[PDB]
Design a protein around this ligand. Structure first.
Ligand SMILES: [N+]
Length: 361
């Protein structure tokens, strides 16, 4: 058991929306990392002596990458960079890599070195030395790179994900799991935490409801249904009626699903489609907005409007936005961002290949 503290920051997509600037997505070939949407980072260090970094701990991807000292692009010059020549434990690989991101590609070459995750010491860990990171308005971003916590099958050639090497090296004891506490509250000192090799009882109430992983790549599982139900409507909103597939993604905020289904959901909520793509709700009519519920392994996971409405500062206008939007992919998926993962503590279990949810504390 070792514990990494997470810090929450306002996403670049949000900073853009405040100045009244929107960028359309997509459609996507499948779920992609998008650096405009990432909201939680935590510290790691690489090499000997340690070189310090802030990275996104991302269940939506499986790669570890950081800006290379050899990268002199704008993004890299504005962040911490890994210098292999300064580390006595560096071990060369040298092969090239490319990753398709929603925010523009990430490219470079593979290297190996000690990766430090709090008190844990991951040895011979492959990483991407990034020479290219796309694109606009990431010069402020408080994170340097990404550390992926998904399965090895969606890693680039030459990388084994960080958690997998923690497993091979016996660093987690008997529980090959990691647990994630996300605090969406702006005020609090702790933004959240990732607990490696354990489950923290202090962070949830009730019991944990497990769901089996369906396709090993993303942390992907089956959802029984999605619905919203209200005393103020002649009909319910019933979606995902015959079951659907979802992924848990700590690398994003909004809940994303098949467009026609979430458009319908947003209409039911009284939403108004912005030219930006998000749906506006009346800020004075948030009180009687119905819960939206996800049924997983026969159990209901309810979201209150307090959980799913996002507030944004436009100019002077405070302005309220639905935390659900459509994103088409060929193999339709609900992507569960922090809107879902904030009010639910989440256990990621590689022993049994399952994901656990319990009410947060
Ligand atoms: N990107």
């Amino acid at each position: 058991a070792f514990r990494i503290p997470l810090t929450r920051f306002k996403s670049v997509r949000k900073q853009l929306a405040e100045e009244g600037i929107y960028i359309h997505e997509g459609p996507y070939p499948e779920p992609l990392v998008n650096l405009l949407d990432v909201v939680y980072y935590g510290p790691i260090s690489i090499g000997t002596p340690p070189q310090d970094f802030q990275v996104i701990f991302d269940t939506g991807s499986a790669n570890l990458w950081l800006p290379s000292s050899k990268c002199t692009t704008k993004y890299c010059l504005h962040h911490h960079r890994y210098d292999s020549s300064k580390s006595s434990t560096y071990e060369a690989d040298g092969r090239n890599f490319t990753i398709v991101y929603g925010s523009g590609n990430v490219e470079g070459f593979i290297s190996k070195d000690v990766c430090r995750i709090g008190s844990a010491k991951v040895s011979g860990q492959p990483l991407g030395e990034a020479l290219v990171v796309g694109g606009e308005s990431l010069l402020e971003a408080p994170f340097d790179g990404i550390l992926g916590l998904a399965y090895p099958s969606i890693a680039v050639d030459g990388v084994v994900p960080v958690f997998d090497n923690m497993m091979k090296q016996g660093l987690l004891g008997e529980q090959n799991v990691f647990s994630v506490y996300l605090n969406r509250d702006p005020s609090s000192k702790e933004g959240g935490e990732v607990l490696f090799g354990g489950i923290d009882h202090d962070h949830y109430k009730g019991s944990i409801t497990y769901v089996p992983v369906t396709a090993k790549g993303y942390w992907q599982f089956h959802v029984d249904g999605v619905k919203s139900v209200s005393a103020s409507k002649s009909a319910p909103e019933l979606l995902c009626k015959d079951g659907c597939e979802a992924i848990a993604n700590t690398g994003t905020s909004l809940i994303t699903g098949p467009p026609e289904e979430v458009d319908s959901l947003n209409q039911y909520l009284g939403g108004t489609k912005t030219e930006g793509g998000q749906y506006l709700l009346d800020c004075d009519k948030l009180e009687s907005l119905p819960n939206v519920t996800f049924t997983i392994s026969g159990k209901e996971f309810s979201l209150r409007s307090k959980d799913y409405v996002l507030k944004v500062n436009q100019q002077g206008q405070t302005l309220c936005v639905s935390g659900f939007m459509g994103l088409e992919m060929p193999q339709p998926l609900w992507i569960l961002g922090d809107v879902f993962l904030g009010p639910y503590y989440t256990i990621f279990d590689r022993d049994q290949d399952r994901v656990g949810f319990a009410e947060v504390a």
